Structures are given as structure tokens and as C-alpha cells.
């Protein structure tokens, strides 16, 4: 019946090829049983690729081709696109390496990459930034070919968003093996931004992270975000990658090669089945190199369209006209303390599912200690100085000039170790003072309210309130309506008073 071919190039064990056709007696779940064919190049060079595709085409009449590569191979995507354009055969790229989206396809192309574009990744990264309320970021791009598309995408996403996205500085570096050591440290030394979005290849990403570590740009107080270009073989990341690096991948990142091959075979089978049930006949197999078609046949243009909109096992695999995946279930992953890539959030349908209410920061990359510029600011509520409010319903988040403050835990029912918090928006005189202080001294802060006590009172030998939080190392500083007196100065150190107060008596003049 239907002939679907699987092409290789990941090398590794050689027995897997047999399994690739053993699964022939596994597709009984899929209607319209498919005859597979397994031939795998082991040098992944243009000559072998072209010759093996030529022989595979010449030997048996194939209806679709599935390609897979390991990692970090650039020009294979162009070769597969060229072969698809010439021979007019529907190819399907799975796994990685060749799954990086190649945006401008040839008019007759049928590459149909199983990847996600740059614009969607930037959309999800900006959604994450909105979730964690990081309005001011800086963009660091190399001279890798494609940075122009990245800049256009970030500008488009910034413009096409309700939030007032701030672009602090865009600086183009010059990475590469060895290269020009200088002119990067100087530029990275004067980028004043708490969150950085970087775009560079795997080796360039490693070099950039090493330079930033030498430049004091990693650790708490600095959050890095990268697309899949920086990630290579997520099974094992390099040591130069800083803990807390955030990226966005597709759902299939955790799947195995066999599962991806099954998914691609299922996609081709469902496309062929839809074509058969629409036209009442099996799809016409492709030809070979000789006698190039020229104008795309109407049957080809119909089989391609049928293959476009296909849904399998819940997840939808609709393909954009450009050849990539439109509206996929994307997962936002990050590098944990133990240097292992683990999922942090999902995307599903336009809605973020983050498992950290507050973004964590770790003692990693704190060799000079002073790099711990991050602070946690305990605070209370007093009507003139600090006032909280519910998030603005129109655009979520908060109103401009309103710092997001998380109430201490969820004491109403979670009065325990449970970390999840509850978000509110804080403003007032003391919040303005704290904002100006963070702008001048150049530090970052996590503002949070206090639930145990109000301002501090020695009860049974312990301290509660903001004084209690600061005295017990739970907060690096406390700001609000905190009065300076002798008992508090003996256990904690105050600052110069910024508003003079005292004890006063109020009466009724009526």
C-alpha cells in the first residue's frame, strides 16, 4: 500500500535500523497500513545524501520521506529542501539538526519541517517575561546569519503587546572559536539590564556565557533567555551554561528517536488517508531526478494541502504555509541547580502554566559574593506610604509605576512551608523611594508583604514583623513605615531617616 521511507544520519547504534522496520508490525492502530523502508546514511554529506535519496527513489515507489539528524547540522536543511523541490516528494524532517525552521522555502518545496519559528518562540518568551514582570530587558545577538530575523521578531512582538516593553540596549557581539577576545568584555561591562535575551549558536552561546561569567553577568540578578539555537543535545548541556538559563522548546524534546519516527510516520499516513478518503484513490508516488516536473501537479498541490492540517493523539500538527508548525504545544524549560534541563512551564493554548510563582535564584556563580545584588524586601501596608491593590484586569499585571508584590505565602489556607505566593500590586511613597534606590545603587529586589506581626515587638524573646524578618535573615532589607528607636538599632542597622516623624495626638475640633 502506502510506502513511507525513513532516512537517518544520527549514526549511533546500527541495530536500530532493523527496529525501524520491525515497527512495520506496529502501525495497526493507524488505518491504511503502511510499508516502511529503512536506509540510513552514516556520513551525512551532500554526495551520500543525494545518492541514497536517488537510489531510494529509483528502487521502490515511495509516497513520503522522513528525515532525522542528530544536532547542530546547518546545511542539511537546505539540501533536503533542494531535493524536495527537484524530485517533488513530500519530505518530513523530525528530531533535530534539520528541524530548525528555514523560513523562505522554494516555490515548489515540500520540506514541512517539524519545528517552530523564531516569532513564536519570542512570543512565548515575552509571555514568560510578562508572567514574571520583567519590563526592562537587553538583547544580545551575535553575527550569526539570521539575527536580522531575530531582531525583526523581537521588535514586532514588543510592538504587538499590551505591556510597555522596554528595550534597554541592543548590542551585537563577535563570537566564534577564539576570535577577537576584546571588544566583547568592554561592551558587556556596561550593559545595565536585569534580564537578557540572547541569540547565538551553540558554540557562540558557550563563548558568550564564558565571557559573561568573566564580565560578572551571570548568577542572581541576571536572567538569561535563549531560543533553541543555543541548546544542543539537551540530554547533556555544557558546563559553561549558567544555572537559570531559560529556553522554549517543543513538546517532543523529551521523546525518543523511535517515538519521533512513529509520529512522523503517523503524520504521513494520516495525510495519505485523508487524501484517499477525499479523492477516493491512493496518493500518487513521486518520481526521481530525471524529467523534472516544473509546474506543481494539481494532485501534488492537493496531497500537500491534505498533509498540512493533520491532528494526531490530541496534539495538533497543523503546518503553516512556510513549512513550520503553527500553534504547537510548547514547553518553557530551564537549567536547574543540578545542571539538568527540566520543564518549568507549558503553553498549550495561549495560556501559561508556570510552576514557580516567583522565579528562583541560586548561589551559583557567586564567586565574589558581591554578585548577589539580589535583595528581598519585606514590607507592610500603611495607607499613606505603602498601598496594595488587585492586579489590573484589563491587561493583567499592574498599572505603570506599581511594583508587583507577593504576599507572604498563602497563609489563608497554606500557612505552611508551601512556597506558592499570591500576587498584588504595591505603590506609594515608600515604593517610590525603593524604586529610586534600586535605580541608583543598581540592584534588583523581590518585594513581599509580611504576615507575622506588623512592625516588630519582642514577644517571649523573639522578633516578629519586618524587624523580625530582617533580624532572622529572611529579608535583606525592610522598607515601609518603620520607626527608628534604640531597641531596634541594637539588633539591626537602620539608614539615614528620609521622613521625620514622632509621637503625636489627634483630637476632634468640632
Amino acid at each position: 500500500a502506502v510506502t513511507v521511507a525513513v532516512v537517518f544520519g544520527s549514526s549511533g547504534p546500527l541495530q536500530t535500523q532493523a527496529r525501524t522496520r520491525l515497527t512495520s508490525q506496529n502501525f495497526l492502530d493507524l488505518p491504511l497500513e503502511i510499508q516502511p523502508l529503512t536506509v540510513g546514511v552514516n556520513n551525512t554529506n551532500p554526495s551520500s545524501i543525494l545518492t541514497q535519496i536517488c537510489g531510494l527513489l529509483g528502487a521502490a515507489r515511495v509516497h513520503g520521506i522522513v528525515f532525522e539528524d542528530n544536532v547542530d547540522t546547518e546545511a542539511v536543511a537546505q539540501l533536503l529542501d533542494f531535493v524536495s523541490s527537484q524530485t517533488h516528494v513530500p519530505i518530513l524532517s523530525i528530531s533535530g539538526g534539520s528541524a530548525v525552521v528555514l523560513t523562505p522555502k522554494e516555490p515548489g518545496s515540500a520540506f514541512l519541517q517539524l519545528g517552530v519559528s523564531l516569532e513564536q518562540q519570542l512570543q512565548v518568551l515575552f509571555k514568560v517575561l510578562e508572567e514574571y514582570d520583567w519590563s526592562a530587558f537587553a538583547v544580545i545577538t551575535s553575527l550569526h546569519p539570521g539575527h536580522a530575523l531575530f531582531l525583526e521578531g523581537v521588535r514586532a512582538v514588543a510592538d504587538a503587546s499590551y505591556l510597555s516593553w522596554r528595550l534597554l540596549d541592543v548590542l551585537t557581539l563577535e563570537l566564534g572559536p577564539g576570535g577577537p577576545r576584546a571588544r566583547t568584555q568592554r561592551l558587556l561591562r556596561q550593559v545595565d539590564a536585569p534580564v537578557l535575551v540572547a541569540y547565538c549558536s551553540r558554540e557562540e552561546a558557550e563563548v558568550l556565557f564564558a565571557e559573561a561569567a568573566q564580565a560578572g553577568l551571570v548568577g542572581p540578578g541576571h536572567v538569561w533567555l535563549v531560543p533553541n539555537l543555543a541548546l544542543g543535545s539537551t540530554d547533556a548541556p555544557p558546563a559553561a551554561f549558567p544555572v537559570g538559563l531559560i529556553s522554549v522548546v517543543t513538546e517532543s524534546w523529551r521523546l525518543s528517536l523511535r517515538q519521533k519516527v512513529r509520529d512522523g510516520v503517523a503524520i504521513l499516513a494520516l495525510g495519505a488517508h485523508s487524501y484517499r478518503r477525499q479523492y477516493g484513490t491512493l496518493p500518487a508516488p513521486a518520481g526521481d531526478c530525471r524529467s523534472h516536473p516544473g509546474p506543481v501537479s494539481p494532485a501534488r498541490e492537493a496531497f500537500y494541502r491534505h498533509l498540512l492540517n493533520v491532528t494526531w493523539e490530541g496534539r495538533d500538527f497543523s503546518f503553516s504555509p512556510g513549512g513550520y508548525l503553527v500553534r504547537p504545544t510548547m514547553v518553557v524549560i530551564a537549567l536547574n541547580r543540578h545542571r539538568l534541563w527540566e520543564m518549568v512551564g507549558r503553553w498549550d493554548h495561549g495560556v501559561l502554566y508556570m510552576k514557580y510563582p516567583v522565579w528562583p535564584r541560586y548561589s551559583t556563580s557567586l564567586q565574589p559574593v558581591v554578585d548577589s545584588r539580589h535583595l528581598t524586601v519585606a514590607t507592610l501596608e500603611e495607607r499613606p506610604f505603602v498601598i496594595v491593590e488587585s492586579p489590573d484586569p484589563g491587561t493583567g499585571g499592574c498599572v505603570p509605576n506599581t511594583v508587583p508584590c507577593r504576599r507572604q505565602s498563602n497563609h489563608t489556607f497554606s500557612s505552611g512551608d508551601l512556597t506558592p505566593y499570591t500576587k498584588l500590586c504595591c505603590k506609594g511613597f515608600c515604593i517610590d523611594i525603593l524604586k529610586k534606590l534600586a535605580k541608583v545603587v543598581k540592584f534588583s529586589y523581590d518585594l513581599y508583604l509580611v504576615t507575622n506581626g506588623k512592625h516588630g515587638k519582642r514577644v517571649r524573646g523573639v522578633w516578629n514583623g519586618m524587624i523580625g524578618e530582617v533580624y532572622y535573615k529572611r529579608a535583606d532589607m525592610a522598607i515601609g513605615s518603620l520607626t527608628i528607636n534604640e531597641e531596634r538599632s541594637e539588633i539591626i542597622d537602620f539608614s539615614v531617616p528620609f521622613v521625620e516623624t514622632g509621637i503625636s495626638v489627634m483630637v476632634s475640633r468640632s
Binding site: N43, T44, N45, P46, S47, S48, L50, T51, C54, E74, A75, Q78, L79, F82, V83, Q86, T87, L102, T103, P104, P107, P145, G146, L149, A160, S161, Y162, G176, C289, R290, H292, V399, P400, N401
Partner: protein, 653 residues
Amino acid sequence: KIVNIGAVLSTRKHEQMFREAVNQANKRHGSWKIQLNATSVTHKPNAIQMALSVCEDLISSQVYAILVSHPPTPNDHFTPTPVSYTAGFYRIPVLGLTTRMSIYSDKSIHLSFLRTVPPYSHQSSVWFEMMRVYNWNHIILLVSDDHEGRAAQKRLETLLEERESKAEKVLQFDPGTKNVTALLMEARELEARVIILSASEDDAATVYRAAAMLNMTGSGYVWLVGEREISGNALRYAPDGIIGLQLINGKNESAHISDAVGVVAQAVHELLEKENITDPPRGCVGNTNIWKTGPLFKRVLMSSKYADGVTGRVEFNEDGDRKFANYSIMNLQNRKLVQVGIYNGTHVIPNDRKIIWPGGETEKPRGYQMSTRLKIVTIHQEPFVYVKPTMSDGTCKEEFTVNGDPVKKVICTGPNDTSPGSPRHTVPQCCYGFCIDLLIKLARTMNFTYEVHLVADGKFGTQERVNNSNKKEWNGMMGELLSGQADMIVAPLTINNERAQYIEFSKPFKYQGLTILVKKERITGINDPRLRNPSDKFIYATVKQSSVDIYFRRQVELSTMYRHMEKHNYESAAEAIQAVRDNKLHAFIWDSAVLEFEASQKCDLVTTGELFFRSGFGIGMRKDSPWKQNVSLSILKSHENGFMEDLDKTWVR
């Protein structure tokens, strides 16, 4: 060490020319030991067989760079693609000599690709220069939907956005599709008289025939096209008087071969000093890694000033494209393609002959044909524009001033409709007042006729995010002026930065500010603590989609101001004044020119504080409207002699 270069040609004779040229290049240089060697291969019909031919011979030999030409018969981007892909797999630089497509400028697809000839997109640059020479501003971009048209449009838009300008409209013409008459019919309406075309031969011929059908080739129009539109089928049906251009050399293969081998040899000699040279992959089979020196070889090859070539100085830009060029400007004068100038690279140089424009004129035509019948939009503001119902015979009540002068009135079409909700019927009324008198004077002075109509939704207009989308779109008189339903706004429209980006404002005809109206005096400006601490005790509001809304929304210091305002905005100024007088709203923030007149006439109300946003009213027009200066001059003249004083005395006592 023998450094070998390679070439893929078609004629089987130009390869001998390439061998001769490389021999001469070897005869002249710093070192003579590198023993520069050359190899060549003829083109293959099958693209896959062509790529395999690249993998053999060229790649199999120890080659450092590859050159590729194009057969004389136009085949477009089909022949250099396989060699480009195969050599970009190993980052082996490939120099194109005759290909013109812009797909090879994209470094994401073709990684190691350089060219000695500019692509079709770069032609847009010279058009910009011509637009600077003849001061043309209103242009139409009739471009194909393929990659070439999109690239040319993107480059022209980038150049225009670097300056302060914008193309009037673009028209996407799907390649190979007949009936382009809809696009030409759309473009005929627009004010722009400069037509820019970017399409293939068949598409150019089709649009030329369609334009001849629509008489769009007559006097006043200007046509600027590219190389593809003055050759082949296009030239046969091309209208006379079009201005095209063509590259000087273009198809001189031998010049581009000598000029390429010279720069390649210079680059090799230049980077040989740093050494660390890595031998090439030596065959497609048996290697899977890129050639390490390759990227650095391309990087040093891109920056190579070979200023001794046949075709002049050779320099490459950031995308590996030949920086400069010389384009000869061609005019179709009586079925003959005559040259009238040469583009040096930054300025067009006219030396001999005279340009004959399509209409037969020997005089440079302006790039617009501003019509006489002018549609003018207006809003209902009491001290400026009184709108009154017309009697059943189609004219409204005659009236005279107290001094004894006749009140001039015009007919207008407003939203008067008995149906609820939106305006569902445009019943005419009669309009008069300050703005209408100014309009009558302006029309008399500038010699144009007008049709006055009222705004649809009763709002002045601020850009707002359109529903079920993420982009912001204008509304009110602003939206109607920008879209094209109205050609000029004669109304009390406050000048501000947000509107000035998209609308052209004349000189202010009335200076005023913003003030606060309350019932008949404990408010001082917008700095009183009550207005800085919003509460139910003191409620304040403005008119939705007005200048005050924009002013408060654009202020970071006054965010809470706008937050409180958003809960109580009003549809119109008159209903807001009525609500304030009836003790339903406490304070109303609005323009001083209207608020002071209301306080004087209707009494029982007081204006408090000093003006906190001083601005003016101005006539609004579309961006870069040709007759802005006229109007501005007239307005200034009206300020000088006596006209604005008389208009103040007669209307706003």
C-alpha cells in the same frame, strides 16, 4: 602549497577566457609560489546531476573558491542554487558573476555566497535618489507577490523610513495571473502620480497593456521600472516615456571573470600572512565537517578593496553584495531606448539629451494631481460649528447678526438618525460658525470647492487597539482623514505630538489651552490635592477619544488621573456641560476656547485655575499634503490683516 580555484560555466569557450585570466593573475603578484591553479566544469541539465558534478571535480579537487555564471538565456535562480548549497555545506565561498536574484542575499539560506553584481533589489536605491532629485514624495509601489517583489518593497520601505516619509500604497500583483485591472483602478483614485513597478517580463507586459487600456500612461503620470521591465516581452508593449535603467556591464562575462579572479587572488595573498590555512575537504565523500578556514576566508574576502578591475572598484557590503555600481538610465523615446544619464553610485549625473515624459511633455511634471472637489469633515462644537436642522425644502432658517450682517451657512451631512445606537441615516443639516467662516475664506482664497460632512461617531479621535487584534487604529475625524473618507479637517482639532506623526497640521488659527469648568471656585489647575487623590467626593471627567484623553494617557506622572477619568468619560462636550450644570458631574476638563465661551454665554458656571496645556487649533491634512503651505500662509495672513479679530468678535463674544 598549490591554491586551486574553480569555475562552473556554460559556453565551453568562456572557460578558456577564465584560464587565460587566471594565468595573467598568476603572472602578477606578491608571492609566486602559491602556484595559483584553476579548474572548470560546464553546466549540467539535471539539477541533481549538477550538484553531483560540483561534488566531483570541483569539490574533489583541493579548491579554495568557486565561481558560477549564468547561461545567456534567462533561467532565473535555478542554475547557481545546487553549487551554492554544495559549497555552503563546507563554507567554501562562491562568487556569482551574472545572477541577479535577491534570494542569494539571504545569508540564512546561502551561507557562503558573494556576488560581483548588485541584485534586482538594489535598483530601488537609485529610485530613492531620483525621488530626491525631482522632489517626488507621493509614490505607488506596484510589486509582485514573489520573493523579488517583497525584497524590493522591503528595501524601498527601509530607505523611505530612514528619511521622514512613507509610500502612499503598495499593490501586490500575483505572478502569472491575468486581470491586474483591479489594482490599476485602485491606484487611479489615489493622488500619487508616480508609478514604480517591480515584476518579471510577462507581468510587466500585462500591466503595461492593462494601463494602456485604462489610459494611465497619459500626461502627468511618471513610470519608473527596472531592468526586467525594459527588455524581452515588456519592451514590446511598454508605453513611451517610461524611465527604466540597466547595468553598464550586466552580461559581460569576461569582465566579471577577470574582475573576480583579481579580487580572489588579492584576498588569498592578504589572508596568507596570518597562515593557519586549512586544506579543503577534498571530496564530498569522506568528510562531514566544515572547512575551518572557510569562514575567515569569506570574512577577509568580503572586505577587499580591489580598485583595479575591468568593471571598476570592487567592494562588498555586509551581506556579500557588490557595494557600488553604474546604472544607465533609459527612456523609451519613440520606440527607442535612449540613455539620458549614469548613476555614479550616490548621485545620478545628467549630461546630454532631454527626458521625454510619457505624456509628451518636455517639462518635469509634479508627482500629484490634487483634485478640486474636496471632502471636508467637521465635528459639532458649539462656539465654532453650530449645526442646525434644515427646513423641509432643503435649506435652513435665514439668520442675521445683531450688527446686521448676513450669516453664511453651508449644507452638511450629519449623523441625524431616528434609529438608536450608531448613526444609521445621514440626514443633511446646515452648518455655520467660526470654522465654517474660516473654511469659506480659505476656499475663496485657494480657489477650490468643498463638500462638508460631519464625523460619523462624534469623536475627535485617538488611536486605539482594534478589537480581536493587537494593533492600534485611529478613529473619529483622525481615522476618517487617514483612511481617505475626508481630505481635510476644518474643526477645533488640538495640535499634539501623537497626531502630528500621522497628520499634517497647519499653523494654529486659534491659540488656547486646557482648563476646568465647575459650578458657580476652589480648584487651582490640575495640581490640587483633591485632583491628585481621586475619590467619590470629587468626580472629574472629559470627552472620550479627545486630546485630553491622549494628554493624560501619555503622562506617566498622571496615570491615576487617567485611571479615575476612564470610569466617567462622556460621549460629547455638550452633554458633559449639561451634566455638570445639572450637578451630575463635579469638574469638567476641556479646552479653554470652548469652556470660556460656555461660561460666558450660559453663565451659572465658572472656570478655575490657569491653563495647564497651551496649544492651538489647526487644519489637519494627510501626511505630506502638497497644499499645506498654501493653507498655512493663508492662516498667517488671516492673523495679520483683520480676519481673526473679526471672527472672534462676531462669534465668540
